[PDB]
Amino acid sequence: PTIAHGDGRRPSKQRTFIVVKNCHKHHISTEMELSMLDLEILHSIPETP
Amino acid sequence: NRGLYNMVNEYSQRLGGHPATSNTEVQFVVIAGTDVFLEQPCSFLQEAF
């Protein structure tokens, strides 16, 4: 909104702002390793202590 | 030259006996100036520091 005036100016009419904000993106990632000797025997079934 | 009741009325009555424009590169004089808020006590009592 604005103020009306008594004295002379060229007054602004009803202003109205439209402002948009776009999103960001963040792509966080890391890397782990796993030995195949801990993956083959993981994918087997043992019967030995 | 007028009396003390007249002197501070004429200093308070939005006279702008020697005004200036607020935001310009080189100092001017305002014409049709009512939006700018300015009084000059140096121009009221005729003295510089």
Curated annotation (Swiss-Prot), chain A:
| Listed name of the protein | Major capsid protein
Tell me which family the UniProt entry assigns to this protein.
Belongs to the herpesviridae major capsid protein family.
**Name of the gene this protein is made from:** MCP
Q: List the disulfide bonds.
A: none
Q: Specify the domain of life of the species encoding this protein.
A: Viruses
- Give a short account of what the protein does: Self-assembles to form an icosahedral capsid with a T=16 symmetry, about 200 nm in diameter, and consisting of 150 hexons and 12 pentons (total of 162 capsomers). Hexons form the edges and faces of the capsid and are each composed of six MCP molecules. In contrast, one penton is found at each of the 12 vertices. Eleven of the pentons are MCP pentamers, while the last vertex is occupied by the portal complex.
Cellular localization per UniProt: Virion; Host nucleus
Source organism: Epstein-Barr virus (strain B95-8)
Summary of subunit composition and partner proteins = Homomultimer. Makes the hexons and eleven out of twelve pentons. Interacts with triplex proteins 1/TRX1 and 2/TRX2; adjacent capsomers are linked together in groups of three by triplexes, heterotrimeric complexes composed of one molecule of TRX1 and two molecules of TRX2. Interacts with scaffold protein; this interaction allows efficient MCP transport to the host nucleus. Interacts with capsid vertex component 2/CVC2. Interacts with the small capsomere-interacting protein/SCP.
UniProtKB/Swiss-Prot annotation, chain B:
Q: Which residues form the signal peptide?
A: none
Annotated localization? Virion; Host nucleus
| Taxonomic superkingdom | Viruses
Family that this chain belongs to = Belongs to the herpesviridae major capsid protein family.
Subunit structure, as described in the record: Homomultimer. Makes the hexons and eleven out of twelve pentons. Interacts with triplex proteins 1/TRX1 and 2/TRX2; adjacent capsomers are linked together in groups of three by triplexes, heterotrimeric complexes composed of one molecule of TRX1 and two molecules of TRX2. Interacts with scaffold protein; this interaction allows efficient MCP transport to the host nucleus. Interacts with capsid vertex component 2/CVC2. Interacts with the small capsomere-interacting protein/SCP.
**Biological role:** Self-assembles to form an icosahedral capsid with a T=16 symmetry, about 200 nm in diameter, and consisting of 150 hexons and 12 pentons (total of 162 capsomers). Hexons form the edges and faces of the capsid and are each composed of six MCP molecules. In contrast, one penton is found at each of the 12 vertices. Eleven of the pentons are MCP pentamers, while the last vertex is occupied by the portal complex.
Protein name listed in UniProt: Major capsid protein
Q: Which organism is it from?
A: Epstein-Barr virus (strain B95-8) (HHV-4)
**Protein encoded by which gene:** MCP
Q: What residues of the intact protein does this structure contain?
A: 1284 to 1332 of 1381
